């Protein structure tokens, strides 16, 4: 317990961003103890890939990059290597060689309301798919042929939609907060 990584500042953040404008916090110089989080009843998704799946119950010194965002329940499966879809393509992309953990949990109680929480957004149109860990927070009208235009107009679109999160809909349309952990091993020797 010599300087464990303060994960609670990430997972218990009062406000989470929209998946198109996903945010990263780096937690520096601490022993990743994500094994304590796996133990929790708290998480509906918990998938570690590569070396994070082998060192899952291990304790080691690293920098942790935490990517936070909200998605629909049906969209949570897109936060995985090799996946395609509007979130995977145009919002948040993991590399095929991803070696970290994906954590998600149902946030119906805080991210949905009786009349619909519409504060969270995703992008549905883009010219090309995102590279892994690329981020696009632009709001420029989209057209198939890439010529400038103002909506409303034939073949001219605004690229952002809202999630509509209600307390009446099933888990698939309910809100999920998602945290992606990337671990960066700290080396000792001098430069």
């Amino acid at each position: 317990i010599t300087n464990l990584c303060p994960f609670g500042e990430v997972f218990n953040a009062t406000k989470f961003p929209s998946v198109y404008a996903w945010e990263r916090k780096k937690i520096s110089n601490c022993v990743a103890d994500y094994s304590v989080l796996y133990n929790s009843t708290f998480f509906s998704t918990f998938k570690c890939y590569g070396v994070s799946a082998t060192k899952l119950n291990d304790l080691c010194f690293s920098n942790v990059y935490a990517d936070s965002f909200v998605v629909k329940g049906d969209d949570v499966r897109q936060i995985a290597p090799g996946q395609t879809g509007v979130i995977a393509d145009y919002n948040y992309k993991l590399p095929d060689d991803f070696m970290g953990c994906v954590l998600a949990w149902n946030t119906r109680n805080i991210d949905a309301t009786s009349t619909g929480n519409y504060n969270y957004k995703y992008r549905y149109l883009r010219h090309g798919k995102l590279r892994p860990f690329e981020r696009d927070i632009s709001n420029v009208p989209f057209s198939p042929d890439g010529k400038p235009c103002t909506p409303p107009a034939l073949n001219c679109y605004w690229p952002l939609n809202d999630y509509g999160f209600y307390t009446t809909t099933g888990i698939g349309y309910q809100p999920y907060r998602v945290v992606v952990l990337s671990f960066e091993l700290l080396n000792a020797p001098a430069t």
Epitope: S114, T115, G116, Y118, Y124, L125, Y157, W158, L160, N161, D162, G164, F165, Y166, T167, T168, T169, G170, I171, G172, Y173
Partner: single-chain antibody, 228 residues
Framework: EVQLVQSGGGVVQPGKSLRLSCAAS????????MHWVRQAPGKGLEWVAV????????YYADSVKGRFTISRDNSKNTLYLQMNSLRAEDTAVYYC??????????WGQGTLVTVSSGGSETTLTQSPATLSLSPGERATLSCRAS??????LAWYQQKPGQAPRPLIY???TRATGIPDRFSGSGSGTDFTLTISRLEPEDFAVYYC?????????FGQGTKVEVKS
């Protein structure tokens, strides 16, 4: 294929009661919210009520609040509406509809309810009222909302006397099965639906709907009719 078969229409007198049924098949009924929407004779669609997937949450338009009770039986895959103390204002074709987070992606056939013997909502303004075109021509329909709905607009196609059918969700995304000659555009208050290369089956009434500002509302429609 998702199927919703309604029953229990008929004519009643004012102050009387009726129950509408909607039997669901071809999907996991218990996972979806279910809505009631109604259409008064020769007019636009109005949102009535919604029940949650598990039947514990229920919400009603102000107009029918306190005398319409929505319910469901998840073993029977059936949705109900108990319509008590009916007025002339309630005369409508009633529709059950599967929830797509307050867009409506599958609709029952409709049941007419005639109550006749006595006896800050977001407004969606569609223009023109009618649009008279020939096959192969381009229809451009407009829907100006009173307040911003961002991109939270859907469009529906209604053939005469038949249930509405979703065309577009979220301003610009087509519903399943909808060919690419239909296209929608806009965010905020100014929205268009373009039907290019009009086909014989495209002649119908078209309804825009907002879901984000409570309660869900529909425009009064644009009739795309064959040019006489």
């Amino acid at each position: 294929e998702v199927q919703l078969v309604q029953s229990g229409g008929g004519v009643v007198q004012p102050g009387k009661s009726l129950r509408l049924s909607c039997a669901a098949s071809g999907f996991a009924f218990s996972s979806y919210a279910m809505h009631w929407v109604r259409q008064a004779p020769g007019k636009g669609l109005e949102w009535v009520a919604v029940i949650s997937y598990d039947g514990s949450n229920k919400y009603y338009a102000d107009s029918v609040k306190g005398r319409f009770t929505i319910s469901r039986d998840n073993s029977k895959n059936t949705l109900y509406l108990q319509m008590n103390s009916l007025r002339a204002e309630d005369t409508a074709v009633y529709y059950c509809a599967r929830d797509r987070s307050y867009y409506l992606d599958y609709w029952g056939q409709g049941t007419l309810v005639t109550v006749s013997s006595g006896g800050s909502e977001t407004t969606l303004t569609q223009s023109p009222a009618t649009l008279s075109l020939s096959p192969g021509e381009r229809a451009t329909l407009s829907c100006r909302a009173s307040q911003s709905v961002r991109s939270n607009l859907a469009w529906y196609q209604q053939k005469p006397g038949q249930a509405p059918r979703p065309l577009i969700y979220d301003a610009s995304t087509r519903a399943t099965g909808i060919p690419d000659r239909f296209s929608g555009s806009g965010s905020g208050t100014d929205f268009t639906l373009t039907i290019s290369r009009l086909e014989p089956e495209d002649f119908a009434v078209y309804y825009c709907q907002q879901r984000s500002n409570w309660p869900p509302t529909f425009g009064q429609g644009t009739k795309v009719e064959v040019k006489s």
